[PDB]
Write a protein that binds this ligand. Sequence first.
Ligand SMILES: Nc1nc2ccc(NC(=O)CCCC(=O)O)cc2[nH]1
Ligand SMILES: Nc1nc2ccc(NC(=O)CCCC(=O)O)cc2[nH]1
Lengths: 214, 214, 216, 216
Amino acid sequence: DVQLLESGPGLVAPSQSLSITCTVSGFSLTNYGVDWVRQPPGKGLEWVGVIWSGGSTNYNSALMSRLSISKDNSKSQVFLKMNSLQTDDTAVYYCAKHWGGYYIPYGMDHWGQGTTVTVSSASTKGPSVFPLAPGTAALGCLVKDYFPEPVTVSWNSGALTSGVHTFPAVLQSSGLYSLSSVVTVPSSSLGTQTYICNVNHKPSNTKVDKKVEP
Amino acid sequence: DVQLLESGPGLVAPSQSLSITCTVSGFSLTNYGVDWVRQPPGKGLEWVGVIWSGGSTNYNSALMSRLSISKDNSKSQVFLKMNSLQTDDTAVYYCAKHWGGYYIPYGMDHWGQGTTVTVSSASTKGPSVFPLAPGTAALGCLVKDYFPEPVTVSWNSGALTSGVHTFPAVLQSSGLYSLSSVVTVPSSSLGTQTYICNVNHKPSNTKVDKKVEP
Amino acid sequence: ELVMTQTPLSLPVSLGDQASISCRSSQSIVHSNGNTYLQWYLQKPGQSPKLLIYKVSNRFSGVPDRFSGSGSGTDFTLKINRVEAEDLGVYYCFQGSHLPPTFGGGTKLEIKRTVAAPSVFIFPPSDEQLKSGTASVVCLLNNFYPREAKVQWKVDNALQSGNSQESVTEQDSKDSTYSLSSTLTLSKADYEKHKVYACEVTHQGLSSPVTKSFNR
Amino acid sequence: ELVMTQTPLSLPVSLGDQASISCRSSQSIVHSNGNTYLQWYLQKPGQSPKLLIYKVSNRFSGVPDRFSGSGSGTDFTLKINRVEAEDLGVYYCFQGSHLPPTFGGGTKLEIKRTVAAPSVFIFPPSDEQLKSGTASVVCLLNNFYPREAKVQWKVDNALQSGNSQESVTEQDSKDSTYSLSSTLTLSKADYEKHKVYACEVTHQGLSSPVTKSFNR
Ligand SMILES: Nc1nc2ccc(NC(=O)CCCC(=O)O)cc2[nH]1
Ligand SMILES: Nc1nc2ccc(NC(=O)CCCC(=O)O)cc2[nH]1
């Protein structure tokens, strides 16, 4: 089954270099080209470059002086490397598989989940997680004072999915992000079931589980 | 003579508010509408809003929720206020005078020099200025470790103009900016004439005059 | 450098109506091999983009018959009949006939549905947070439509300003609703100064404002 | 909302040549009152935009005869009969027929002139800077064309990487050349560990790469 998954450093300081790997599964790089596409916060998709099945590359005009794409067919990995990072370069970076056609693809059938690069001189900080305490009952977790984006939040290790709202983060005046995740549940179950929010902040390697009680 | 000149805080923290004043001279605001236009670093002009002569306003769609424009006809001042500042809002802001037509202007004939707004949680830092000691001789000043933009550089209080190159600042991994100004001068004059670079950084209220000797 | 112009930028459409998105190229995107490589992608909230249409008019596998692409040369249209809640997101056209390939600016599709009043909840700061020096009081507006909503903080009936932040989700893929959080942030000291914390909410689905409060 | 589509994004043009910049609107910008409020602005390096053309084809005062605007409905052109050095900048079209008004994306005019090799200068760190514990070494490439240049840093012939930054001016409005600074930054400790500091410059105007160096 076809998968693509991007891996990168999360946070890079301005002027320095960025390396992202895209690991691919269920097809061979010797047979398919792969595009790199970026999305800056709140903006549109931008095509960054392509490495074709035979290994030749083409690049975005605006970035090409600072950009290289390469790959390792045997390892099913495609690498993007960019020098002299600017604040501008802050984006979610995606790799995408070609589909159809011979020299020119018909489309990009499969995309990775993306990886969030923040270009900043600040340092990583893991989040503080505080409970938002309870026919219908709302409960939540306040995920405060972390940097950079992103944080993922789940409930009961993913068993609870319906009625979950994880709000977009807000950037505070301290330069740190905060958000809250809420879940809506039956009040009757506030005595029988435990509710834990699982919070993951990859850039700080921080994982927090918080039990939320009345 | 028509003049417009924007004034603002230089650096604003995220989530907080931006107030800018455009002070106008040589025409009456009772008679002319004024536009605000902004320019994000390396990007194009974006129209922000208008306050018409009679005082009604119209806004950019993306920004209308967080934007107000008002004025004081008697003071010759136009005011832009924006809430909930996001990193995105970093830009040079311009006010521009209407010209032509009655209800819709034909163009914007006079523009201010612009004011630079950086949205950041970092604090202001004044630059360190170091000399770059020398039939053509090059000399300069290294204007290092400041935040935010801009710095202004002149030579010999503005008397020296030909052969001056003030380079676009570069953002360092420390998150501070650095730039150099160089001037090309006759080698014969190195014994006779003094060369002083006058460096100004308004957000820190720093003003340096550095003599650059051999 | 071929430019793709996508309009409109945002497209509110009622459930079950037709949406029509336009993409114009700065030059012909008919390749010299006779193909025209125009694609339409949909990026749903919190998702990677997904391929809908390739070669102007061909549906990718799994793409419902409601989506149709057409056009030629420099002028192209995506049409979605009977718009559904799941169609919500940002549509991009993309051109691969010319190097470099280019995306359009995107079209945000917003679903217009019937009015839904929010449920309102208020949450006191946790004791943990207070003992680290700050008080965050959260007001939640859950599952409403339309997006526009008024949230006012009052502390001992004093109307608060400048000390709160609002976050709104993207529209929901199943019921086309929004939710909103409003966070009132205070020093521990200032928080322990007052008794009543009230979140006051105005919305079009409500016949009057709804206040949710607690006593510290 | 109306999108204004400007092409090309960049326009390298030889001194003395013709230039033509296109602006297309996503819909007619003919106002219901019959006027078409299309303007062109030029923003030079270091400067605020200035009005060139208004109402499609009318030259603003001071604007040389060389500039002319034409077109109608949705399709407009700025032309320059004999491009000069001072015409360097970013041209923007602008529409005020429809609310909200909108700028095009810009067309960057770059001037193509003859080859000019750089003059190369190296500056050691100032004594003043050393006194604060940092060592910046600056290589200056002055007045060259074209923009493409390579600057390598060598310390006792050990090629450097990762510890320097370049800045390049905008193209000059009088002779259409560029200048470029490369700054090598080292700790004072590390600077005082090595003798030979070399700036090595490659450029089309030079017969071979030129090294400028000094001994600490
Ligand atoms: N997902 C995609 N990545 C790319 C990269 C490049 C594309 N197009 C071309 O290279 C056009 C070349 C035309 C020619 O054959 O001369 C098309 C494309 N689509
Ligand atoms: N420099 C400029 N600022 C503005 C602001 C608004 C402009 N145009 C309109 O408001 C057109 C409205 C047309 C109508 O509805 O009659 C035009 C304009 N030009």
